[PDB]
Amino acid sequence: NAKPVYKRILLKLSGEALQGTEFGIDASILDRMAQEIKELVELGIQVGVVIGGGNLFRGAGLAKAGMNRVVGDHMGMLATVMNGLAMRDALHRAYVNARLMSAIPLNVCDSYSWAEAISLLRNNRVVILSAGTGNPFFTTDSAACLRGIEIEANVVLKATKVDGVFTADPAKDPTATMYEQLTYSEVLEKELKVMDLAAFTLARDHKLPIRVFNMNKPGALRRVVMGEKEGTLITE
Amino acid sequence: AKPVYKRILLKLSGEALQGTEGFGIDASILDRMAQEIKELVELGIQVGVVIGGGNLFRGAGLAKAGMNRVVGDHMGMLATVMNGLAMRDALHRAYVNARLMSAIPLNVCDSYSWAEAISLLRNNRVVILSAGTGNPFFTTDSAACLRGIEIEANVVLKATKVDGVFTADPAKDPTATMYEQLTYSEVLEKELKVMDLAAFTLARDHKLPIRVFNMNKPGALRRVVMGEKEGTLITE
Amino acid sequence: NAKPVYKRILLKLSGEALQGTEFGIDASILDRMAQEIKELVELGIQVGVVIGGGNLFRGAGLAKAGMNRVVGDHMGMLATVMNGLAMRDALHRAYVNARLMSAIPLNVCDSYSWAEAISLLRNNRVVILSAGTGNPFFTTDSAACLRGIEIEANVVLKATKVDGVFTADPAKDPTATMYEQLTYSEVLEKELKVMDLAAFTLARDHKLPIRVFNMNKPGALRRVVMGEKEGTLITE
Amino acid sequence: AKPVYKRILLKLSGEALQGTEGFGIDASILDRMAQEIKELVELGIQVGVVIGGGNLFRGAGLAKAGMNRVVGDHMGMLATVMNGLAMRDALHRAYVNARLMSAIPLNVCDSYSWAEAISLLRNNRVVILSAGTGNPFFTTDSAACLRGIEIEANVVLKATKVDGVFTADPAKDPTATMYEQLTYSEVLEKELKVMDLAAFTLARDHKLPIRVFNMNKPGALRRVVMGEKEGTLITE
Amino acid sequence: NAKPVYKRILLKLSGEALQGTEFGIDASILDRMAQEIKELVELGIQVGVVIGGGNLFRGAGLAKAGMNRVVGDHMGMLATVMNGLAMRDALHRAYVNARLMSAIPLNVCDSYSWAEAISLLRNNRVVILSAGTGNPFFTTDSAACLRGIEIEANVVLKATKVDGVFTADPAKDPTATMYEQLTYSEVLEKELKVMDLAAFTLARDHKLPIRVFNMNKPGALRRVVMGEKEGTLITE
Amino acid sequence: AKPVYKRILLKLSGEALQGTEGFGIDASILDRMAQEIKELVELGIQVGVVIGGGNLFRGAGLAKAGMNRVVGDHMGMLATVMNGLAMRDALHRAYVNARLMSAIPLNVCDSYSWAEAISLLRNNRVVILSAGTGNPFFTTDSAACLRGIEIEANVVLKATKVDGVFTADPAKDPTATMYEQLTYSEVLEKELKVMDLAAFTLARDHKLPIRVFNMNKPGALRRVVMGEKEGTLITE
Numbered sequence A, C, E: 001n002a003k004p005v006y007k008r009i010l011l012k013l014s015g016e017a018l019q020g021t022e023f024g025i026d027a028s029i030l031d032r033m034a035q036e037i038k039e040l041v042e043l044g045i046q047v048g049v050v051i052g053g054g055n056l057f058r059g060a061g062l063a064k065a066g067m068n069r070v071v072g073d074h075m076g077m078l079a080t081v082m083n084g085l086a087m088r089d090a091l092h093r094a095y096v097n098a099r100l101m102s103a104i105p106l107n108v109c110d111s112y113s114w115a116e117a118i119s120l121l122r123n124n125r126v127v128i129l130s131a132g133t134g135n136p137f138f139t140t141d142s143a144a145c146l147r148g149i150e151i152e153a154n155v156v157l158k159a160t161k162v163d164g165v166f167t168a169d170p171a172k173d174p175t176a177t178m179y180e181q182l183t184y185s186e187v188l189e190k191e192l193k194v195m196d197l198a199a200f201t202l203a204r205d206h207k208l209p210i211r212v213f214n215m216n217k218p219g220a221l222r223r224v225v226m227g228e229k230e231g232t233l234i235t236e
Numbered sequence B, D, F: 001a002k003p004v005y006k007r008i009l010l011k012l013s014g015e016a017l018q019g020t021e022g023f024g025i026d027a028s029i030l031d032r033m034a035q036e037i038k039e040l041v042e043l044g045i046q047v048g049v050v051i052g053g054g055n056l057f058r059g060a061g062l063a064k065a066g067m068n069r070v071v072g073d074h075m076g077m078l079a080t081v082m083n084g085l086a087m088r089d090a091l092h093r094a095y096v097n098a099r100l101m102s103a104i105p106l107n108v109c110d111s112y113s114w115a116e117a118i119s120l121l122r123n124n125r126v127v128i129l130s131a132g133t134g135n136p137f138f139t140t141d142s143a144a145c146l147r148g149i150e151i152e153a154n155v156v157l158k159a160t161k162v163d164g165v166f167t168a169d170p171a172k173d174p175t176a177t178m179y180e181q182l183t184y185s186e187v188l189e190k191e192l193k194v195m196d197l198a199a200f201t202l203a204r205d206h207k208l209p210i211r212v213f214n215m216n217k218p219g220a221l222r223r224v225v226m227g228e229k230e231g232t233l234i235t236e
């Protein structure tokens, strides 16, 4: 009798979380991703997914090596388009209707269009938003919040490799602990790592709730949507 | 003792930008490539470059993992655009006029246009050609021979990590010897591995000469262009 | 009780076969074409058609007259887009759902897109692929085999003006005879005229059967699809 | 005795490229046109060219055959792009800077852009304008007067196979005489055939002078531009 | 029992009539517009609407101030795209399927395409045509007649701020009177203000009836469509 | 006494082109702006311009009226393109090379391209950047700081109708005084209104200096660029 507690969601997929040991993409994690997204679609949930590129390139990182920061961000963005393309295909092969859209118009997929996106969602099609915001100096987390506000999602689900928001990187600091609930205020006064002010403040400004969970946990995405104890919730 | 080629078509394998890790791009090797191409431009030579994507993706390889071959080939092509973009930036940072063109419209960079290409070339601007031929079921080798014939290059220079064409792999067999010259017919007869059959065949029909050389041996590119003994030549 | 022996086909239409006495297009042959394609659509067959331009321009021919070979191929390609447009219209007027796609993005029709093409076919829409492969130095026969492999056709039906594959041009050599069956091997050891190695080898490589028939024969296309004795079959 | 026009708009009828066969393009006449335009460019004159498609297709003609008029007009326009492409190549082969622009985006050639056009013109590059006005129910004559007014040409030179404007067809009536000058009003009053009414009317309202001359009479184009007695002038 | 007397109409909306006191747009007039268009859609009528830009910019007017006439027309056109976008949104918010198309390809809406437009109309979607004809020196009235003939409307409904065609501007001349019926002949011999010959003659040429009514009159559009006494009818 | 900035980013508020009426564009102020920018170009300074759209539309303002915020922001952006087009024409009419680029592909003008921008700038061509950042929920101020950082401008010059930054509005309070210099920290601490928080914050992180000055005070722009006491500087 459960029933989902969300009608339209914006699922931000970390690029790094498509690696799963060794750079590149992990086909089996991609296929699991599809199956889990398939379930949401059937449950009637409208899904829009913003995907990152950290498993291939990060602009700032390339900038340290000497490259022009803008060109570095452009490669980072093309990296998100490569993930989006792999994700879409995994979706099609799992018999799920999906469309890839790119912030920077390319031709291989559609160009992002607001009205078109809303139409696709109302029609139960999964919409994959690539190239983030289309601009350099930004991160895909920003795009998740922007697109999330544009398509009017009920919430942004940040898929990560950790169970929630920790006080410090749980993989490097042995003192790291995660909270299960936070307000946009607490996040700043405690200075916990969630996103980057740019993205965050935008979400706060527009009162868009955020739920941080672990995508490496099979079933976690479904628990979040069904309203079961998973991850951390950031509200006002 | 001036150069022997007015216009060439440099074909770099995606692995050419790989560091010691065996994947991605290595800033220092990129910058080194840019200096070597800078010298050719100053020498009066017109340069067109076709770069691969093996340091990132291969369609056949992805298809084995379950993915749709065509989508795998699109990601491969897209990777060659990531390389072309990094190569262009190294060029601009070394003060060399260069323009990235793509066989797949990506209005990042502009689209490949034969007429525009010939114009950029006549103006001493290095033309970088990404996305191979624009179609799946093809390799960047074929794009090198194709573009090479379109822009009327004097020769296709195939960059490898070996000094030339051997009787067998010299690293997996110390008996192997390097040919100083060959005809398309002998390559096929002796079952020699130079490049993709489709591509090779194309170059043979249009009598486009091929020079296989070592891009890691300092001075090689210049020597190959100065008519000095270096690598293997292939004609007929 | 017949029932078609093919579910998805790639129909390669020769440009020359739309002339029918006197250059240009033959409206009545175009309308018959539509009616016959209409029948396949109703039978449930998914049709993708690659159309040539030989009735208007051929690149190599223009090259002999002195023109730049690449520009010549570009005109040849625009010629296929003109035929595709006429074909599409004949289809619409016969109340058949059809979409025109061009290898070289134009705007008047759609730009070729793999995923989009598959969706249109699954939806029983006729897909007309123009501008061949998008590249010069190639022929539309190449494109028929490439697109045929891309959309995963069960077979490529080469529509011609002769009943099959002959030993020599039946219109010029009085010794010309046609075979009714051939393997990709036989085709080469006998050196019979079918396509051009480029195209052919590709088809062979991917084990795509080919059936050569005469489109000037009213009903021939329907016989081929129903599995009746028509034309020549090339298999491995 | 320098030229009398700084910038002109040469309007070539599609038939201007037709050989003796009465269809298509004749390489030798094309090359001859290129030499005559080369001379004008050297003389300091800025040249814009609008070419028709009657040596290939006409929308009204196709519509009579059953086809949708709009589609017929698209094919007609597309033919003017085939001519513009061949004319551009003859130009480049005669060493004349020229760029083909299209009223129908064909990202082959680039799109018509008024500002870019004026810039190319000021840079002594022959601008070739294809696809007429971009809309059906119009002729390339109207595009000649329209573009002529946009680029602020000093005059529209209408190339015909006759010496000028006659009282009646001189080939179907030996009584006919050639006017050396006329006003838009007299043309309409005497029911004289100069061009499409829509087009004519447009030129009259913007006071764009028209010179009708013979493109086959050697030296004519130069004479018309050197203020020497040649053809018919039309103003008011 | 009424029943509409038209199946497909082309509704030309004056840009000025979206102001309603004070430049800019009048949201409440826009919402009424939507409701009235909603009714037509439900009645089964296929609606195509051409919208002007006179409430923001007029090319000729900008030309007097000193600006380049062509650039002035380009701004006028962008003005029609801004109105089209506002109109579309008002339509979506009233739960009416609508698509915006632009004569000059932009990316934010679709690019105008004939076949696509017809498909959208057959599917009961409202089609908004912006950027008029795409060319300078023309008015949106021209585009209304051109698009009207293209999509094969049964009639063009010119929405204005006056009840019909008057002898003189009813707001400035106290002698102004309107006729209730006119032939294309009468319109010229009486020289009444309806459109501009360009547009008009085109409509006449193609025998497209025109009905001029007042959109500020709530219900007037519905009366016209139902065949009730409203506005002025221009026929041959 | 040469200029103190090699490359600047001039940000003009849409209201900067407004006449006394309080809406639209005033030809004379436009021409005056062009003369002031002409002088900078002659002085060797590279100029990038980001113009707003408040003299026409604001998304938030439209959203209050009932419209979809995103669509309101698209119309706003589109208005900045109307201004950019008028500003470009005034520039060309004053004989200043200038190119309009848009963050929203409008193939009127070409699309924004970082690399192309840097090239135009190095060539002494004024680059006009329209459509802000390309995304809704942003202001042109943010686009000024963003583009300013991308093109590596030496400073962002914020044109206002006031002499600089005051303690309070000087027109609504005669006690207000003008700061001659400030740090990002003091602006935020003293609750000073300089620009959009999002934008400001961005400029602070990249240490992009901001100069607020009066665009109506003749000579101001030149003085600001000649290192002479004028307006308010903001750095840290």
Ligand SMILES: O=c1ccn([C@@H]2O[C@H](COP(=O)(O)OP(=O)(O)OP(=O)(O)O)[C@@H](O)[C@H]2O)c(=O)[nH]1
Pocket (backbone or CB within 6 Å): A013, A014, A015, A016, A017, A051, A052, A053, A054, A055, A057, A058, A059, A060, A072, A073, A074, A075, A076, A077, A079, A080, A131, A132, A133, A134, A135, A136, A137, A138, A139, A140, A141, A142, A143
């Ligand atoms: O709006 C955007 C989004 C992305 N990008 C560029 O794409 C690159 C991809 O970086 P992402 O931020 O997409 O990486 P990711 O999601 O995998 O990383 P985490 O969430 O785990 O931190 C970024 O480093 C940036 O340079 C932009 O330039 N603009």
Ligand SMILES: O=c1ccn([C@@H]2O[C@H](COP(=O)(O)OP(=O)(O)OP(=O)(O)O)[C@@H](O)[C@H]2O)c(=O)[nH]1
Pocket (backbone or CB within 6 Å): B012, B013, B014, B015, B051, B052, B053, B054, B055, B057, B058, B059, B060, B072, B073, B074, B075, B076, B077, B080, B131, B132, B133, B134, B135, B136, B137, B138, B139, B140, B141, B142, B143
């Ligand atoms: O025309 C093209 C070119 C390339 N590709 C796609 O790019 C992928 C990378 O293949 P490449 O041919 O780009 O590899 P590479 O140059 O780095 O490697 P070498 O052959 O030099 O050893 C291919 O596996 C394919 O998926 C296309 O599908 N089409």
Ligand SMILES: O=c1ccn([C@@H]2O[C@H](COP(=O)(O)OP(=O)(O)OP(=O)(O)O)[C@@H](O)[C@H]2O)c(=O)[nH]1
Pocket (backbone or CB within 6 Å): C013, C014, C015, C016, C017, C051, C052, C053, C054, C055, C057, C058, C059, C060, C072, C073, C074, C075, C076, C077, C079, C080, C131, C132, C133, C134, C135, C136, C137, C138, C139, C140, C141, C142, C143
């Ligand atoms: O991939 C392609 C396809 C076509 N083309 C160009 O289009 C032209 C049209 O030539 P086609 O090969 O399309 O002609 P056709 O089908 O009518 O001829 P047959 O099958 O009967 O032999 C060719 O001559 C070539 O120049 C390309 O450049 N590339």
Ligand SMILES: O=c1ccn([C@@H]2O[C@H](COP(=O)(O)OP(=O)(O)OP(=O)(O)O)[C@@H](O)[C@H]2O)c(=O)[nH]1
Pocket (backbone or CB within 6 Å): D012, D013, D014, D015, D051, D052, D053, D054, D055, D057, D058, D059, D060, D072, D073, D074, D075, D076, D077, D080, D131, D132, D133, D134, D135, D136, D137, D138, D139, D140, D141, D142, D143
């Ligand atoms: O604006 C345009 C121009 C041309 N066309 C299309 O191009 C076709 C060719 O008509 P053209 O007007 O191009 O013919 P032409 O110049 O060769 O012939 P003359 O008038 O000089 O005798 C026309 O019949 C129409 O279908 C358009 O529809 N729109």
Ligand SMILES: O=c1ccn([C@@H]2O[C@H](COP(=O)(O)OP(=O)(O)OP(=O)(O)O)[C@@H](O)[C@H]2O)c(=O)[nH]1
Pocket (backbone or CB within 6 Å): E013, E014, E015, E016, E017, E051, E052, E053, E054, E055, E057, E058, E059, E060, E072, E073, E074, E075, E076, E077, E079, E080, E131, E132, E133, E134, E135, E136, E137, E138, E139, E140, E141, E142, E143
């Ligand atoms: O085909 C076209 C249409 C429109 N435009 C340009 O758009 C501008 C908008 O002018 P319109 O003619 O669209 O204005 P309107 O409809 O509001 O005015 P009325 O019907 O009440 O007279 C025109 O002034 C012109 O410069 C073109 O350049 N070409």
Ligand SMILES: O=c1ccn([C@@H]2O[C@H](COP(=O)(O)OP(=O)(O)OP(=O)(O)O)[C@@H](O)[C@H]2O)c(=O)[nH]1
Pocket (backbone or CB within 6 Å): F012, F013, F014, F015, F051, F052, F053, F054, F055, F057, F058, F059, F060, F072, F073, F074, F075, F076, F077, F080, F131, F132, F133, F134, F135, F136, F137, F138, F139, F140, F141, F142, F143
């Ligand atoms: O990135 C952008 C820029 C602008 N806009 C849209 O443009 C509208 C106009 O807002 P602007 O920010 O262009 O206004 P302006 O410069 O004239 O005004 P000041 O801030 O200088 O006082 C905004 O209200 C928004 O709708 C975007 O949505 N995105």
